Amino acid sequence: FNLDVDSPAEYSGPEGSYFGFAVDFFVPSASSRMFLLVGAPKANTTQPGIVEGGQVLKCDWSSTRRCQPIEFDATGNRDYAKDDPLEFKSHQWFGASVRSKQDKILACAPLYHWRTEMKQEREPVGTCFLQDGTKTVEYAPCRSQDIDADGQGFCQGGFSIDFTKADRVLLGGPGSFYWQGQLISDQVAEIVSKYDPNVYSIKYNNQLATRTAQAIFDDSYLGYSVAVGDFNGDGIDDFVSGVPRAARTLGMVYIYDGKNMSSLYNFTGEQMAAYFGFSVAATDINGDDYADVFIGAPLFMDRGSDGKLQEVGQVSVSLQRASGDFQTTKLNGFEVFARFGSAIAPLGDLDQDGFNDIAIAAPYGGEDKKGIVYIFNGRSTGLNAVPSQILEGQWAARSMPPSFGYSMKGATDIDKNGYPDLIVGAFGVDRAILYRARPVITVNAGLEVYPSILNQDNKTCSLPGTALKVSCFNVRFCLKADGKGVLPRKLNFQVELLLDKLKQKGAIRRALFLYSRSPSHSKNMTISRGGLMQCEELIAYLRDESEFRDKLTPITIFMEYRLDYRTAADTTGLQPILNQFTPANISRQAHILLDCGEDNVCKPKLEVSVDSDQKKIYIGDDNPLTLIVKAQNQGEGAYEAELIVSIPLQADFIGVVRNNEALARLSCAFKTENQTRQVVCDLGNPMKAGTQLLAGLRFSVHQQSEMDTSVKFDLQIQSSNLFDKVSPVVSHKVDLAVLAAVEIRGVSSPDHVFLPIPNWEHKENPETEEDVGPVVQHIYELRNNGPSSFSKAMLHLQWPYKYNNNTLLYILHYDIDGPMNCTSDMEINPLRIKISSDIHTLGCGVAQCLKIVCQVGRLDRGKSAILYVKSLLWTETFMNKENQNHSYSLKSSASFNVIEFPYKNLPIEDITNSTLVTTNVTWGIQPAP
Amino acid sequence: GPNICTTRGVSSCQQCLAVSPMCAWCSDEALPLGSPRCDLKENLLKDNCAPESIEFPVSEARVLEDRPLSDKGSGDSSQVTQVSPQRIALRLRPDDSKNFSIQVRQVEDYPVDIYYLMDLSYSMKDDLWSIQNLGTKLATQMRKLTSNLRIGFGAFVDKPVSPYMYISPPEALENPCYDMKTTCLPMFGYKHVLTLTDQVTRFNEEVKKQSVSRNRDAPEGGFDAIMQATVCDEKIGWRNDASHLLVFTTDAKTHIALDGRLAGIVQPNDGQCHVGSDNHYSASTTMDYPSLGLMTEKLSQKNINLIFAVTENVVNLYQNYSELIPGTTVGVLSMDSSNVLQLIVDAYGKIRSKVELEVRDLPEELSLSFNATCLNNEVIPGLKSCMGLKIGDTVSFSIEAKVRGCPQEKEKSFTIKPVGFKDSLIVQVTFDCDCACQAQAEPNSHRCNNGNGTFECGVCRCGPGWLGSQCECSEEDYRPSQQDECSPREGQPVCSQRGECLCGQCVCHSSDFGKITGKYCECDDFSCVRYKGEMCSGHGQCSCGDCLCDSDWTGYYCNCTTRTDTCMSSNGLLCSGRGKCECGSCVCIQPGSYGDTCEKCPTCPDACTFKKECVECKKFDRGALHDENTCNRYCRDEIESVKELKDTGKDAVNCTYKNEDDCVVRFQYYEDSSGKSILYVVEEPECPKGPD
Numbered sequence A: 001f002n003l004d005v006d007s008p009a010e011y012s013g014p015e016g017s018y019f020g021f022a023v024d025f026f027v028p029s030a031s032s033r034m035f036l037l038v039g040a041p042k043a044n045t046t047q048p049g050i051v052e053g054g055q056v057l058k059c060d061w062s063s064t065r066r067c068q069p070i071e072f073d074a075t076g077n078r079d080y081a082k083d084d085p086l087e088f089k090s091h092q093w094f095g096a097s098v099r100s101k102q103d104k105i106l107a108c109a110p111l112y113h114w115r116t117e118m119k120q121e122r123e124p125v126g127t128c129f130l131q132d133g134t135k136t137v138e139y140a141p142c143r144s145q146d147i148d149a150d151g152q153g154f155c156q157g158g159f160s161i162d163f164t165k166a167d168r169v170l171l172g173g174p175g176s177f178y179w180q181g182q183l184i185s186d187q188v189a190e191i192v193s194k195y196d197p198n199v200y201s202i203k204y205n206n207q208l209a210t211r212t213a214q215a216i217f218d219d220s221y222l223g224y225s226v227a228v229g230d231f232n233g234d235g236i237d238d239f240v241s242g243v244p245r246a247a248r249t250l251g252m253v254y255i256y257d258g259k260n261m262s263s264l265y266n267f268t269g270e271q272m273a274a275y276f277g278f279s280v281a282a283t284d285i286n287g288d289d290y291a292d293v294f295i296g297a298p299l300f301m302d303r304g305s306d307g308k309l310q311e312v313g314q315v316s317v318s319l320q321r322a323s324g325d326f327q328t329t330k331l332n333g334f335e336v337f338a339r340f341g342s343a344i345a346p347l348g349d350l351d352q353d354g355f356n357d358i359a360i361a362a363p364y365g366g367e368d369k370k371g372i373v374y375i376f377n378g379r380s381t382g383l384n385a386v387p388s389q390i391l392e393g394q395w396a397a398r399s400m401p402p403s404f405g406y407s408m409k410g411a412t413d414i415d416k417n418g419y420p421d422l423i424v425g426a427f428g429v430d431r432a433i434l435y436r437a438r439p440v441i442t443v444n445a446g447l448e449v450y451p452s453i454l455n456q457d458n459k460t461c462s463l464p465g466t467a468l469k470v471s472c473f474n475v476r477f478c479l480k481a482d483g484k485g486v487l488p489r490k491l492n493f494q495v496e497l498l499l500d501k502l503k504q505k506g507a508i509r510r511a512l513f514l515y516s517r518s519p520s521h522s523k524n525m526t527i528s529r530g531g532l533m534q535c536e537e538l539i540a541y542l543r544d545e546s547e548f549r550d551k552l553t554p555i556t557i558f559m560e561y562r563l564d565y566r567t568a569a570d571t572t573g574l575q576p577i578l579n580q581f582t583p584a585n586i587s588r589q590a591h592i593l594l595d596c597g598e599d600n601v602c603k604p605k606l607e608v609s610v611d612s613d614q615k616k617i618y619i620g621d622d623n624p625l626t627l628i629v630k631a632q633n634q635g636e637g638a639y640e641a642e643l644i645v646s647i648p649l650q651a652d653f654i655g656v657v658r659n660n661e662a663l664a665r666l667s668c669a670f671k672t673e674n675q676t677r678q679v680v681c682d683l684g685n686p687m688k689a690g691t692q693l694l695a696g697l698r699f700s701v702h703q704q705s706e707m708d709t710s711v712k713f714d715l716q717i718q719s720s721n722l723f724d725k726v727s728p729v730v731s732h733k734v735d736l737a738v739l740a741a742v743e744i745r746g747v748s749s750p751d752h753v754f755l756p757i758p759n760w761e762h763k764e765n766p767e768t769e770e771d772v773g774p775v776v777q778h779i780y781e782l783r784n785n786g787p788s789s790f791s792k793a794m795l796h797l798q799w800p801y802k803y804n805n806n807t808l809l810y811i812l813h814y815d816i817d818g819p820m821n822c823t824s825d826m827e828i829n830p831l832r833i834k835i836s837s838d839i840h841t842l843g844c845g846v847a848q849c850l851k852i853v854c855q856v857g858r859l860d861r862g863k864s865a866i867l868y869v870k871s872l873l874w875t876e877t878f879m880n881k882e883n884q885n886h887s888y889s890l891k892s893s894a895s896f897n898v899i900e901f902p903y904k905n906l907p908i909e910d911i912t913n914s915t916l917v918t919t920n921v922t923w924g925i926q927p928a929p
Numbered sequence B: 001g002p003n004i005c006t007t008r009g010v011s012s013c014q015q016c017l018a019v020s021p022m023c024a025w026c027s028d029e030a031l032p033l034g035s036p037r038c039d040l041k042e043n044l045l046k047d048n049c050a051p052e053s054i055e056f057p058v059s060e061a062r063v064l065e066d067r068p069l070s071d072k073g074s075g076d077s078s079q080v081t082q083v084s085p086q087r088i089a090l091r092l093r094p095d096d097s098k099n100f101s102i103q104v105r106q107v108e109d110y111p112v113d114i115y116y117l118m119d120l121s122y123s124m125k126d127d128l129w130s131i132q133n134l135g136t137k138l139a140t141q142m143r144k145l146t147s148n149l150r151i152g153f154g155a156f157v158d159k160p161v162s163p164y165m166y167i168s169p170p171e172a173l174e175n176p177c178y179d180m181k182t183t184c185l186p187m188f189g190y191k192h193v194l195t196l197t198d199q200v201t202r203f204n205e206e207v208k209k210q211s212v213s214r215n216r217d218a219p220e221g222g223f224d225a226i227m228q229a230t231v232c233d234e235k236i237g238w239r240n241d242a243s244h245l246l247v248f249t250t251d252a253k254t255h256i257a258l259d260g261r262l263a264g265i266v267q268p269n270d271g272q273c274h275v276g277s278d279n280h281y282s283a284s285t286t287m288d289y290p291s292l293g294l295m296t297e298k299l300s301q302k303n304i305n306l307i308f309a310v311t312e313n314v315v316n317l318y319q320n321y322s323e324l325i326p327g328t329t330v331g332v333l334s335m336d337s338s339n340v341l342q343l344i345v346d347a348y349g350k351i352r353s354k355v356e357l358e359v360r361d362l363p364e365e366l367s368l369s370f371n372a373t374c375l376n377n378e379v380i381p382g383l384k385s386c387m388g389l390k391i392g393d394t395v396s397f398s399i400e401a402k403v404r405g406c407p408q409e410k411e412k413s414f415t416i417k418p419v420g421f422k423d424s425l426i427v428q429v430t431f432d433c434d435c436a437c438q439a440q441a442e443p444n445s446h447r448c449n450n451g452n453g454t455f456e457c458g459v460c461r462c463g464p465g466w467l468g469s470q471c472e473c474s475e476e477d478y479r480p481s482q483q484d485e486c487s488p489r490e491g492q493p494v495c496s497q498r499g500e501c502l503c504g505q506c507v508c509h510s511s512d513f514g515k516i517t518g519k520y521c522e523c524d525d526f527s528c529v530r531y532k533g534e535m536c537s538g539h540g541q542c543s544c545g546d547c548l549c550d551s552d553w554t555g556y557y558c559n560c561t562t563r564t565d566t567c568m569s570s571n572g573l574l575c576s577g578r579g580k581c582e583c584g585s586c587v588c589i590q591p592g593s594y595g596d597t598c599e600k601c602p603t604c605p606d607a608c609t610f611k612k613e614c615v616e617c618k619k620f621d622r623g624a625l626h627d628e629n630t631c632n633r634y635c636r637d638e639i640e641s642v643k644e645l646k647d648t649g650k651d652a653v654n655c656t657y658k659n660e661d662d663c664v665v666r667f668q669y670y671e672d673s674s675g676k677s678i679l680y681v682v683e684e685p686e687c688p689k690g691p692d
């Protein structure tokens, strides 16, 4: 929120050169000066016979915004032979990526083409150039003798690059191995020490590199983007890369071990073609020394309010924990087609608040699509999803979108003011712009009035001019300020005071200052940085008894403080800024003496009670809980009376009830002040003597927090009086209860079988399902609908196995769906049958029973366990059932008994029920009628 | 009696209307000071108010153009109309609503445009051969569904640039198949070949002249071609009143937006046409592939139906892409494009089997709710689309337009249109915020008694300090004045304790939060309900203790969404066929069913007990589905009478039942045999046998 947008440094390059496509800071150790580095991928150079070779410009910051090309390579194409170039530097896009660590600068040409020395070719291996002062080596890992597309021919190495802390280069090549992609890391020392201009294919000793894999991974673009950070024990930077076409264009992000290129963690996008992995970034956003992963998907489509898909782009934020598991949330863009998430640039601590910050770009957002950059501050709880500042592009298109935001870089305090600054690139208009961070001031104001209770009959001090005396009081206001970094010694504040603020705009001015005789009074003020809480006093009197009529409405003293930051600016005009979460004003209020007894002091007798609701709070879901409170003042008047309902974490305040016309509609509000959550309700100012209130406070308590007895609310009335200012605190326990609507249901497929069975031939020694009869499926489902969960249950299935030595329903195989195991007391499928590719009731009471018993684990709300029993109709039995024609109802039954719950310290009760499932075997042919 | 009008509208005529649609104003001085000025229309009459001096605007929605629905699409006489009405003037007063209706017809014998956009990678050499006679062969089958048919042709490979293209050796440019011991055309992004013509033979001619090329990497650049075929309306030659089919044929995966960066292409697709006289996509080398969002936007505008005709190896892929571009249909193409014909026909019927309404340029403070009458007279609430339709069928939609507050704009026009249709209902919305009597207002003093206030609509309203009925008291200190009845009663506190009663009225205290209004200072601008720390769930404005929900939210808390998309199943069925979509969430009704869209129901009866009804409906003219007249709609599977049942094939479910005639009927059904669904019935049900 503290980035200056009034006077930002604006740099420019040759039109069409894509000046600004890549940006970074240059912070050499050999100099106390700092510079800007800008890539111009399409820039024309003095390289002989090379068109648009591209260049990298070093830009001064001290005064003149002058940009000078760095001389990496002045030579044109080397030759394989006469009239036969070995390389092609034209349109190589040199400058398309720029990185700098201290005195060393790395720049790359991802479209540099290479002939190879085997055959006439033009393969985009890509190359990089590493410079250090005057020495310049050429790093080009993909330019090896492993040629063609199956090799590293189309690697385009240098497409994305980064240094690690231990001076080590990470390099991405999206085209290696049929566009699978590749990561290659080398020691900077070896990149320099092993350089040899007479060898086009240098091999470095301590090289780390991902290797080719199966062809299903083709066209994934590994190394499209790269970032580095630590994601394991050792303090070694690991490798983070975006793989935007991975997983059928779902996109992925790979993380490799910085020690030996071993795979660590993967991320996967959720919407195809969203280009998840277009941009990556690593930075510790919640001040816990654990680097956090940011992933950009600029073409993500979220669901609009209408319900329709809309392309707004999305950024994934993954918080790293010491456990190894990431804690990930998601962050969506604000404009359609703006491509929010095209660039994610860490800023370090932009406002020096103790937590790092980050910038996300939407380079085609804003009106006239000039480009937007959003700033997000970090905090202990993670990243604050609400942007504290937007940065708008200032240049309109010519032939291409300005693309302001397409490249960015921060985390480098370039003016040494104590605050890191930010470079934004706009390659569409060949522009790069540097925003400086402004110093942040934390100011706390004081305001007190002596005395608080005004007595109209106490005319003490004299009124200037007249011989009259007045009932006066003191108004003392204080200002202390301090801020980190570089900022002035003294500060100019424009403080103004107002008497009876809540009673103006055509109302009567009820309290005035002694001299101005007006409710308003301004004052220039200059305080010193630190702990010098400079204060100033004023004397304000009170109009005569006859002047006004209202004497119950408190007299609100209002103070607001401005800042002459147009004066406190530095030499370059970098004006400070106030902390955004600080109130620019403050209010106190005095009250007039009224009905306070003979002692002139109001001593209330506050007391609060809560009706026994007897409501139960069933563990598992959200519970409607309405507390009824009675707040009465059986003493004198209580100024600024407030009901304080301190609530537990599991509870949220819905609102005060209003449907009841016999219940007071209090003005309540929920504040999270300090580490305590509570509800505050105004009870009157003052809550007059004898006043009694009945109010309803609706709540909803979300639970399922396992073992607990109950939840309690604490209630206490408090006032701003000096004597008996509070009431006795009252606790209200509401018992937690267990309830689990557990049901069991069944079904037969089919639920009937008609005889005779078509094409059924009786075989003495059956082998297949076809030989026995039709398939009959019984499915049993035990489901826990209820709020509460249960931990253990038993399921008992009784199966009609035989009727007088006759097999009926022959069980082949049973399956299980959910937290349960089953066990049949009889051997299932004894005859090893495999293939694939007046109605009389036969229950287990009158038939030989096959029992299947099942132990069931924990079923939470909405979960279930399912038993699939696949059986065959033993046709033989029904054909020669002594006689043929008869109607049978094959009945199976399943019961369940819930035996345990996880909520051990709470009243429970075992749950039991059962259902039955029939398969009716009848004769569709009736030989009567 | 005491109402909302007499407690909020008393301030002024404009705010009187703003209070409620049922409020009315009085512009007659004859009414003595003491009676309300803003009240019900009847109550003002009852208080003897001059009917001419009464301001009572009424919201209306009159139809401006009401052409009837066409019966044939080949109607050369009158212009084909498939939507009625066509234009409605809507006029609303503050916070008022007005419902209306629209009829959409899938007109019989509608004209058809078919642009054949073809992958010409080397793998498609055999396909290019099988479609040599596709034209005439296609013209016959289409004749069964339409008389007026135009077709065209277009081809694509990929961007003629590294790394997608061979650029070395020099012989590779002229012939990408130099090493493959043959010849193929050089690389080309997209070339338009045949403009949409009714001369079907021209297709066959042009196709035989074509030849394939060869790309280096697997993904191609079809998306470029899809975009260009969509927005180059003149080149391709899309007809206004014709169904537009864009047949996309490929056998490989595809490049997507941002892929172009490797090629050095970083200019985002502009969605504009770039196919010129040479009939080649000129921007191919300089502009990136189009994003799915962009393709959707342009397909929707130009009313184009994208048909993904892809081969088995890439079906699941393009299937998933299709779900990101709604309205797009995917078909499975053979390796030689032999079955491209039936694919197109099957796709067409699928396309015209549904009607979904879309809204364009809907004003900010205006909300629309929909009801859908798709089948018979069954009214489906909260739905704006119908499925399972046959050509010739007509659906209906009931719509309600409600405004929040009253936006003081000039004139706004928006569109309610069925997706892919040319015809539409254009709604001209006008807002009646202020009264007409305010036009003849009086600036200050003069007529407003001896004071220096202001006077309009037969009433006065002074300035700072002056709170008198007609400019009486000054900046207070004007004695007790009236004291007044500044409360619903008298034993009750004054001005709801949020102000003092000065000069026969209330003067509400200020508040840092927001605004305190109302006759008795009883209106609260920030006491509305909360759902999760936010007021009105952060989806509604607080108006005197009431939440006024945003364009897509409902409920007293403003936390219930009007969305249905999160209730749609894989069947394209709302909560399957088992529940209803309440607040973007399926509430399951079908016994023992569950899941986010009621997809799961393991204890539901076997599929036999459902298909049976179709057999009783289609093949016996009886059963529940017959009685409710839902046979044709619900039973769409082919039901073929057969002699005997087979054991060969796969997925043969044997279903039997006893009908009203006490005969045992047996039937089996196929599922995804090829995306289809057959159902065979033994033609000789097992009946009783007489003597015997």
Ligand SMILES: *[C@@H]1O[C@H](CO)[C@@H](O[C@@H]2O[C@H](CO)[C@@H](O[C@@H]3O[C@H](CO[C@H]4O[C@H](CO)[C@@H](O)[C@H](O[C@H]5O[C@H](CO)[C@@H](O)[C@H](O)[C@@H]5O)[C@@H]4O)[C@@H](O)[C@H](O[C@H]4O[C@H](CO)[C@@H](O)[C@H](O)[C@@H]4O[C@H]4O[C@H](CO)[C@@H](O)[C@H](O)[C@@H]4O)[C@@H]3O)[C@H](O)[C@H]2NC(C)=O)[C@H](O)[C@H]1NC(C)=O
Binding pocket: A212, A213, A214, A217, A263, A264, A265, A266
């Ligand atoms: C983040 O996501 C990424 C992307 O999804 C994951 O990366 C993938 O991880 C998997 C799992 O390790 C990798 O699969 C492995 O691939 C190995 C590659 O070997 C290749 O070259 C050799 C020749 O040197 C070839 O033999 C292989 O190809 C052959 O087989 C394939 C089919 O698999 C055929 O298509 C080919 O024609 C060849 O015939 C490869 O090209 C591979 O060696 C490895 O195989 C082992 O593991 C599998 C089971 O996964 C076994 O079936 C197999 O037999 C091997 O394991 C046995 O044998 C070894 C000895 O060889 C014993 O030591 C073992 O005990 C065991 O008996 C496996 O298939 C994949 O390559 C990789 N992809 C990429 C791009 O990185 C990350 O894992 C993931 N990270 C996290 C944290 O989730």
Ligand SMILES: *[C@@H]1O[C@H](CO)[C@@H](O[C@@H]2O[C@H](CO)[C@@H](O[C@@H]3O[C@H](CO[C@H]4O[C@H](CO)[C@@H](O)[C@H](O)[C@@H]4O)[C@@H](O)[C@H](O[C@H]4O[C@H](CO)[C@@H](O)[C@H](O)[C@@H]4O)[C@@H]3O)[C@H](O)[C@H]2NC(C)=O)[C@H](O)[C@H]1NC(C)=O
Binding pocket: A014, A015, A016, A017, A042, A043, A044, A051, A052
């Ligand atoms: C770096 O330096 C180079 C020059 O060395 C500049 O490149 C020149 O850019 C201009 C345009 O900006 C080019 O002029 C145009 O040439 C086109 C034909 O040549 C192109 O295509 C052929 C195809 O074989 C190639 O051989 C050749 O290299 C080129 O790629 C013409 O089509 C143009 O004429 C018409 O079009 C334009 C635009 O529509 C109209 O305004 C004209 O009136 C006319 O109708 C035009 O003449 C020039 O050819 C380029 N030279 C080279 C060698 O490529 C870069 O601009 C410069 N870059 C920077 C950032 O400084």
Ligand SMILES: *[C@@H]1O[C@H](CO)[C@@H](O[C@@H]2O[C@H](CO)[C@@H](O[C@@H]3O[C@H](CO)[C@@H](O)[C@H](O)[C@@H]3O)[C@H](O)[C@H]2NC(C)=O)[C@H](O)[C@H]1NC(C)=O
Binding pocket: A621, A622, A624, A625, A654, A700, B531, B555, B557, B559, B560, B583
């Ligand atoms: C929008 O917000 C409101 C307010 O929180 C939600 O209302 C709550 O809805 C739940 C639904 O489960 C209600 O719980 C029900 O309680 C009844 C007893 O009254 C019980 O029989 C049901 O089984 C269920 O548990 C709850 O009453 C209600 N809360 C209150 C007091 O308003 C609403 O659900 C939200 N809408 C959505 C879908 O976001």
Ligand SMILES: *[C@@H]1O[C@H](CO)[C@@H](O[C@@H]2O[C@H](CO)[C@@H](O)[C@H](O)[C@H]2NC(C)=O)[C@H](O)[C@H]1NC(C)=O
Binding pocket: A233, A257, A259, A260, A262
């Ligand atoms: C590559 O190096 C990593 C560590 O940098 C190795 O990871 C180790 O894996 C073993 C199990 O085999 C763990 O017990 C150790 O904790 C890991 N080491 C460290 C330092 O954390 C990994 O084994 C190496 N790769 C291969 C293929 O061996």
Ligand SMILES: *[C@@H]1O[C@H](CO)[C@@H](O[C@@H]2O[C@H](CO)[C@@H](O)[C@H](O)[C@H]2NC(C)=O)[C@H](O)[C@H]1NC(C)=O
Binding pocket: A450, A451, A455, A458, A460, A461, A471, A472, A473
């Ligand atoms: C009468 O009013 C006077 C004037 O306000 C009071 O005198 C001041 O009391 C405050 C208490 O904080 C002191 O700090 C000031 O120094 C006093 N002012 C003067 C001029 O002495 C006084 O307390 C009141 N007396 C009673 C008994 O009501």
Ligand SMILES: *[C@@H]1O[C@H](CO)[C@@H](O[C@@H]2O[C@H](CO)[C@@H](O)[C@H](O)[C@H]2NC(C)=O)[C@H](O)[C@H]1NC(C)=O
Binding pocket: A522, A523, A524
């Ligand atoms: C506080 O001091 C400032 C100057 O710092 C005074 O500002 C004056 O105001 C006028 C109108 O803006 C300027 O044109 C003058 O130049 C200022 N005077 C001076 C001395 O520079 C301001 O009057 C002071 N404020 C109060 C309320 O005392």
Ligand SMILES: *[C@@H]1O[C@H](CO)[C@@H](O[C@@H]2O[C@H](CO)[C@@H](O)[C@H](O)[C@H]2NC(C)=O)[C@H](O)[C@H]1NC(C)=O
Binding pocket: A560, A582, A583, A584, A585, A586, B512, B513
């Ligand atoms: C006194 O401080 C309060 C709280 O900081 C101010 O309230 C904010 O005022 C700004 C500007 O008017 C509004 O945009 C915000 O919505 C208010 N914030 C909150 C929390 O409501 C108030 O403006 C200040 N009063 C004066 C006169 O400066």
Ligand SMILES: *[C@@H]1O[C@H](CO)[C@@H](O[C@@H]2O[C@H](CO)[C@@H](O)[C@H](O)[C@H]2NC(C)=O)[C@H](O)[C@H]1NC(C)=O
Binding pocket: A819, A820, A821, A855, A856, A857
């Ligand atoms: C179903 O049976 C399995 C196998 O006995 C149980 O899973 C085992 O749980 C024990 C707990 O003592 C573990 O030690 C084993 O490691 C588990 N087995 C395997 C293969 O890992 C499971 O508890 C049973 N489920 C229920 C609900 O009874």
Ligand SMILES: *[C@@H]1O[C@H](CO)[C@@H](O[C@@H]2O[C@H](CO)[C@@H](O)[C@H](O)[C@H]2NC(C)=O)[C@H](O)[C@H]1NC(C)=O
Binding pocket: A248, B316, B317, B320
């Ligand atoms: C297409 O999308 C579907 C989802 O609609 C994918 O189906 C699932 O994919 C996930 C992730 O790979 C797998 O874990 C599941 O096993 C798949 N389920 C099903 C129903 O098969 C599918 O993989 C996608 N196919 C392609 C080619 O993109």
Ligand SMILES: *[C@@H]1O[C@H](CO)[C@@H](O[C@@H]2O[C@H](CO)[C@@H](O)[C@H](O)[C@H]2NC(C)=O)[C@H](O)[C@H]1NC(C)=O
Binding pocket: B099, B100, B369, B370, B371, B381, B382, B398, B399, B400
């Ligand atoms: C869609 O159907 C529903 C249900 O009949 C309608 O809901 C009613 O709408 C009227 C106002 O037109 C309300 O007064 C009723 O309270 C509503 N009933 C219920 C149960 O919601 C809805 O109006 C219909 N939509 C349209 C545009 O007619």
Ligand SMILES: *[C@@H]1O[C@H](CO)[C@@H](O)[C@H](O)[C@H]1NC(C)=O
Binding pocket: B099, B100, B101, B398
């Ligand atoms: C509008 O809808 C209402 C029900 O809300 C219905 O009774 C009425 O007939 C409809 N009016 C018109 C003209 O569509």
Ligand SMILES: *[C@@H]1O[C@H](CO)[C@@H](O)[C@H](O)[C@H]1NC(C)=O
Binding pocket: B445, B450, B451, B452
């Ligand atoms: C208002 O009008 C009166 C004449 O009726 C005039 O005397 C007076 O000056 C005006 N008010 C002010 C503030 O000038």
Ligand SMILES: [Ca+2]
Binding pocket: A229, A230, A231, A232, A233, A234, A235, A236, A237, A238, A258
């Ligand atoms: Ca590490």
Ligand SMILES: [Ca+2]
Binding pocket: A283, A284, A285, A286, A287, A288, A289, A290, A291, A292, A319, A320
């Ligand atoms: Ca962290």
Ligand SMILES: [Ca+2]
Binding pocket: A348, A349, A350, A351, A352, A353, A354, A355, A356, A357, A377, A378
């Ligand atoms: Ca910070």
Ligand SMILES: [Ca+2]
Binding pocket: A412, A413, A414, A415, A416, A417, A418, A419, A420, A421, A436, A437
């Ligand atoms: Ca700085």
